[PDB]
Structures are given as C-alpha cells and as structure tokens.
Design an enzyme around this catalytic site. Structure first.
Site, PDB file in Angstrom:
ATOM      1  N   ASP A 121       9.103   8.999  -6.804  1.00 21.83           N
ATOM      2  CA  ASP A 121       9.151   8.336  -5.519  1.00 21.83           C
ATOM      3  C   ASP A 121       9.849   6.975  -5.528  1.00 21.83           C
ATOM      4  OD1 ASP A 121       8.732   7.980  -2.718  1.00 21.83           O
ATOM      5  OD2 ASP A 121       6.739   7.140  -3.042  1.00 21.83           O
ATOM      6  N   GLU A 137       0.817  -1.201   0.000  1.00 20.47           N
ATOM      7  CA  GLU A 137       0.000   0.000   0.000  1.00 20.47           C
ATOM      8  C   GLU A 137       0.851   1.251   0.000  1.00 20.47           C
ATOM      9  OE1 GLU A 137      -2.543  -0.648   3.306  1.00 20.47           O
ATOM     10  OE2 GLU A 137      -0.912  -1.080   4.716  1.00 20.47           O
ATOM     11  N   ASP A 187       4.826   1.848 -10.004  1.00 22.27           N
ATOM     12  CA  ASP A 187       4.266   3.111  -9.526  1.00 22.27           C
ATOM     13  C   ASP A 187       4.746   4.364 -10.253  1.00 22.27           C
ATOM     14  OD1 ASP A 187       2.570   2.022  -7.753  1.00 22.27           O
ATOM     15  OD2 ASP A 187       3.345   3.135  -5.987  1.00 22.27           O
ATOM     16  N   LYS A 239      -4.487  -2.224  -7.840  1.00 20.98           N
ATOM     17  CA  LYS A 239      -4.336  -1.061  -6.963  1.00 20.98           C
ATOM     18  C   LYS A 239      -5.665  -0.302  -6.843  1.00 20.98           C
ATOM     19  CE  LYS A 239      -0.899   2.616  -6.534  1.00 20.98           C
ATOM     20  NZ  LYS A 239      -1.326   3.886  -5.820  1.00 20.98           N
ATOM     21  N   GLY A 294      -2.767   4.432  -2.464  1.00 26.49           N
ATOM     22  CA  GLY A 294      -3.683   3.308  -2.339  1.00 26.49           C
ATOM     23  C   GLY A 294      -3.181   1.938  -1.911  1.00 26.49           C
TER      24      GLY A 294
END
Ligand SMILES: O=C(Nc1ccccn1)Nc1cccc2c1[C@H]1CCCN1C2=O
EC number: 2.7.11.22
Length: 279
Positions: free
Chosen positions: A119, A12, A137, A33, A16
């Site tokens: 990220d 997570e 991601d 997701k 999400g």
C-alpha cells in the site's frame, strides 16, 4: 497504554489510528499505532527484527488487555506534506533521484525477506531533516481509500500478487514527484483501471499473457491506444523515462525488480542532498 502520553493524532490508516506520543520510561517521542489473532502476533514479531536505514523501525509491540499497539520510531514529516509545500517550484531533481534511490534500497531489502508493502503512497513515505526517506506501514497488510497507487493485477482481481505491486506504486509516486500531479487519480476501481488503460493502452495477450483470464477482466473493456511517455512525464529525461516505463510494465513478470532498478543509468549521478524543510 499508561506508559505513553499521547501528544496528538499523527494520522490513521485502514489498520488503525496513529498518535505522536512520549514514552515516559525513556522520554523518547514515538509513533504509536493502535490496531488478537495469534497469527498476527507472530507475523508482527517478525517485522520487529527487520532493520534497515530506509525502513521505519518497529520499536515495540504491546499486546495488552486483548488490544494491540505498535510502537514505531517517530520521523519528522511525510512526503505528501513536503510535496504540497513544494508544489509551486517542485522538488529538485537531485532530491527526487536521492529519494527514489533510497526507497528502492528499502524495497530491495524488504523484498529479499519476502515482505511486501502492498500500500505505498506519499502519506506513508517519511522524511527527516538529514536527507533520508523511510517506508512506513510495511508488512502490516499481510499481518492483518485511495486507489491511485494500486497495480493493475490487484484491480483485476488477482489474489496472489508479488513484490512487483510495490514497484508499480513507486513508479506512480516517481511520476507524481516529477510532474506535481497524480499519474492515475481514479475515484473508483473501474475509473482507476480505465485511467491506467487510457494512458498505457488497454492490455492484451501480447503485452500481458494471461490477462484475459484474470478474475475481473471483461472482454467488453474499451480499447485505448498507449500514449507516449514524453507526453506523460515531461520534463523527465530519457534515462528517467526508460526506468519509469520498466516500473510500469503491465505484466508483473516483466516489471523491473527493486534490485535491478538500483543499477539503472538514471542513478549514475545520485547524491544525497539535504532538503529544505519546515517542521
Ligand atoms: O513518524 C511519523 N511521522 C509523521 C509525520 C507527519 C505525518 C505522518 N507521520 N509517522 C509514522 C511512523 C510510523 C508509522 C506510521 C506513521 C504514520 C504515517 C502514516 C500512517 N502512519 C503509520 O503507520
């Protein structure tokens, strides 16, 4: 959704919860997701078309009953669990070099399409049994808390950062794979900035023009001298240290691009070894 049987929580992020699931209409296992701004729907649709071997494929987008689900290909294990499983012996250099090389091909591809990850961390780098590694991601931050991998310009309040933030994060990961210890494990924004300053030297206008006029820069920051990289990442060889120092340049404009890093002498002997993994 009804077409998916959840098997368990993969993880997570900030955007999400992620579940490993089975798509009853294809039988395929997938990463699901659960995240709707029209702008988001648009941006996401774009990510769907971006295909590359080193990027986790976005299979489908389900905008239903005012909810948004992203269906991604499932990949066997993340880099963090493999690093923890390898902490006693460390990951072999040839595999570290293969993984960095592949990650740079992926970033170079993304960056050429003006898509930043923003990220990167071990948790979102996924590896398979065949020796490949993939960025997961990517593009989501744009679309819609460990600070260890954050570039200094983000910590100093810059709002318009570039592709260079991803090279910074990758450099921190590169160092962590080599030494088996996080490079800058800050526990707050200021502690993070200071751990970076204590190793790389407090920046100034000579090494980073414009730094003193960044939104969160304070004249009162302590002034630390820069440490030598031979002390920071032993036993990385000199080619590895030189590439790393270029990924960690303070000034985003001087930081090496993913593309140029692919031609660095460090990668002259790259190969693609198969990892020793337990699923
Ligand atoms: O396929 C996956 N496998 C996996 C295995 C172990 C741990 C985490 N993931 N994971 C996967 C695939 C696509 C997107 C995502 C993920 C997980 C990794 C962190 C956040 N997540 C995502 O946003």
């Amino acid at each position: 959704m009804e077409n998916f049987q959840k098997v368990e929580k993969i993880g997570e992020g900030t955007y999400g919860v992620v579940y490993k699931a089975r798509n009853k209409l294809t039988g395929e296992v997938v990463a699901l997701k659960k995240i709707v701004p029209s702008t988001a729907i648009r941006e996401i649709s774009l990510l769907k078309e971006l295909n590359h071997p080193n990027i986790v494929k976005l299979l489908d987008v389900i905008h239903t009953e005012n909810k948004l689900y992203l269906v991604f290909e499932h990949v066997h294990q993340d880099l963090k669990t493999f690093m923890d499983a390898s902490a006693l012996t460390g990951i072999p250099l040839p595999l570290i070099k293969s993984y960095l090389f592949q990650l740079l091909q992926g970033l170079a591809f993304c960056h050429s399409h003006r898509v930043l990850h923003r990220d990167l961390k071990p948790q979102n780098l996924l590896i398979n049994t065949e020796g490949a590694i993939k960025l997961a991601d990517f593009g989501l931050a744009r679309a819609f808390v460990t600070l260890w991998y954050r570039a200094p310009e983000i910590l100093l309040g810059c709002k318009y950062y570039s592709t260079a933030v991803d090279i910074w994060s990758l450099g921190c990961i590169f160092a962590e794979m080599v030494t088996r210890r996080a490079l800058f494990p800050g526990d707050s924004e200021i502690d993070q900035l200071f751990r970076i300053f204590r190793t790389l030297g407090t920046p100034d206008e000579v090494v980073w023009p414009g730094v003193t006029s960044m939104p969160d820069y304070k004249p009162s920051f302590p002034k630390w001298a820069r440490q030598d990289f031979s002390k920071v990442v032993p036993p990385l060889d000199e080619d590895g240290r030189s590439l790393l120092s270029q990924m960690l340049h303070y000034d985003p404009n001087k930081r090496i691009s993913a593309k140029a890093a692919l031609a660095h002498p460090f990668f002259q002997d790259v190969t693609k070894p198969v990892p020793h993994l337990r699923l």
